[PDB]
């Protein structure tokens, strides 16, 4: 917007962290699954 362009200097680092941690966890689980296919 014009004088109300506050969103330009903002970033949702909170969501990014939530998503990043979700991904890291799921990649960790997936890895266990493939490894445990025989121990």
């Amino acid at each position: 917007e014009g004088p109300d362009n506050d969103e330009r200097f903002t970033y949702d680092y909170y969501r990014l962290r939530v998503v990043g941690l979700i991904v890291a966890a799921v990649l960790c689980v997936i890895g266990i699954i493939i490894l445990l296919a025989g121990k």
Partner: protein, 268 residues
């Protein structure tokens, strides 16, 4: 030789020459495409400069400016940087209707020169006289520090509204058009005196938004001179200058995020 024969030494050179040549050519290619995705007028991200920093002229050894009044070369170090900044706000530097403009001698509202486009020439910036900085060689006794708000493209500094309570409760509250700066230390052993545009202790909103170096060269940002004519002597005084606003915030880590950290000591 060490490893191989001459014939082998050559071949290993012909390889790494072509190899590293290709790699350099590829690296450069990826740099080209990166640049191709970027604007010339505005950076892709601005969230890391977001809350504006407040910086001053006196080059602090460690957020500190200690010196002796009864000594000449005791403060000549801080006068070097003080001069460096103010030397830019000369009237001879601001000549003709291009690229400067005479703006309200009193704090006014924002000025939009269109978009971040080259569809116009150099966006015309507001003039600023160093003569608006009353009282301030500089203060040989009781320094005359000069404040400054860090430039951010498209940033509209918004002052606080007088809805509720305020630190400098309602005094000279130019609510609509001034970004205030109140310095503090309890520990009240000083004498705060502020100088600026229109005589106000703030930044005139008519100097915003900044259009960037590419669209606004020679642009001048507003200054706020602060003088501490403290009646005390020979002690470290931790003075913090704070700016207030809707778009202004602070951090415990970044001690320059919209504020000062000055340790004055007139050890004379």
């Amino acid at each position: 030789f060490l490893g191989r024969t001459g014939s082998s030494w050559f071949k290993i050179f012909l390889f790494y020459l072509i190899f590293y040549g290709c790699l350099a050519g590829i690296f450069i290619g990826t740099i080209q495409v990166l640049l191709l995705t970027l604007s010339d007028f505005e950076p892709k991200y601005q969230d890391r400069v977001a809350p504006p920093g407040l910086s001053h002229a006196p080059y602090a050894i460690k957020t500190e400016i200690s010196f002796s009044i009864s000594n000449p070369k005791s403060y000549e170090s801080f006068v070097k940087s003080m001069h460096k900044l103010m030397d830019l706000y000369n009237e001879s530097s601001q000549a003709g209707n291009s690229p400067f403009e005479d703006c309200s001698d009193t704090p006014a509202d924002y000025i939009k020169r269109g978009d971040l486009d080259d569809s116009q020439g150099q966006k015309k910036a507001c003039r600023f006289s160093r003569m608006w900085l009353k009282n301030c060689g500089y203060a040989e006794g009781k320094p005359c520090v000069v404040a400054k708000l860090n430039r951010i493209i498209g940033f509209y500094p918004k002052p606080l509204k007088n809805t509720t309570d305020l630190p400098e409760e309602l005094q000279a509250n130019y609510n609509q058009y001034v970004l205030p700066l109140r310095c503090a230390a309890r520990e009240k052993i000083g004498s705060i005196e502020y100088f600026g545009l229109g005589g106000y202790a703030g930044f005139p909103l008519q100097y915003y938004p900044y259009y960037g170096k590419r669209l606004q060269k020679k642009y001048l940002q507003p200054l706020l001179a602060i003088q501490f004519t403290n009646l005390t002597q020979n002690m470290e005084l931790r003075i913090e200058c704070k700016v207030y606003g809707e778009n202004i915030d602070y951090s415990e880590k970044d001690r320059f995020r919209g504020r000062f950290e000055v340790k004055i000591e007139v050890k004379s």
